[PDB]
Amino acid sequence: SMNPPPPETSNPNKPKRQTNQLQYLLRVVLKTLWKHQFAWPFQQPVDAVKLNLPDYYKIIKTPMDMGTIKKRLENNYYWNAQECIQDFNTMFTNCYIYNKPGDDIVLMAEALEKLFLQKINELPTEE
Numbered sequence: 001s002m003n004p005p006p007p008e009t010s011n012p013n014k015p016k017r018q019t020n021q022l023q024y025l026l027r028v029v030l031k032t033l034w035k036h037q038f039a040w041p042f043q044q045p046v047d048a049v050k051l052n053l054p055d056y057y058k059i060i061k062t063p064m065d066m067g068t069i070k071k072r073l074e075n076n077y078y079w080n081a082q083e084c085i086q087d088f089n090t091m092f093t094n095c096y097i098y099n100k101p102g103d104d105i106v107l108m109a110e111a112l113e114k115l116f117l118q119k120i121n122e123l124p125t126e127e
């Protein structure tokens with residue numbers, strides 16, 4: 001099986017805006033997570049072909065990854081910070097759904113998720 005197309009990261013029909021919360025998500029949250037020692041499996045769409053995971057996109061029907069999230073932020077694709085936060089949550093829950101408790105990739109996701117939650121606890125009030 002081929003990989004599916006990646007999620008949309010640009011739509012010229014969508015209205016755009018900048019908010020201090022979206023700037024924080026890009027400049028602080030995504031930066032902090034990207035540099036984490038466990039980030040690398042999460043920095044791009046899951047390449048099921050390359051990794052020989054025939055069942056990944058049979059099980060995961062709402063794919064998400066931090067590469068996609070970053071592109072969405074850089075493209076001003078998100079209107080609301082909540083959209084971005086949901087995409088992070090989708091990413092982590094996909095990892096948990098595909099794998100099993102205690103799997104190394106799951107422990108890696110948990111660590112990134114704990115860090116994510118800590119950073120979004122510091123999200124500035126909407127300016």
Ligand SMILES: Cc1ccc(Nc2nccc(-c3c(-c4ccc(F)cc4)ncn3C3CCNCC3)n2)cc1C
Nearest residue numbers: 041042046047051064065091092094095098099104105
């Ligand atoms: C030792 C090793 C070698 C290569 C990789 N690379 C890699 N890249 C993208 C995906 C996954 C992956 C995911 C996954 C990752 C992100 C996500 F959002 C949802 C699911 N869930 C499982 N996997 C692999 C399945 C085969 N065994 C390695 C993990 N692994 C990782 C590790 C630990």
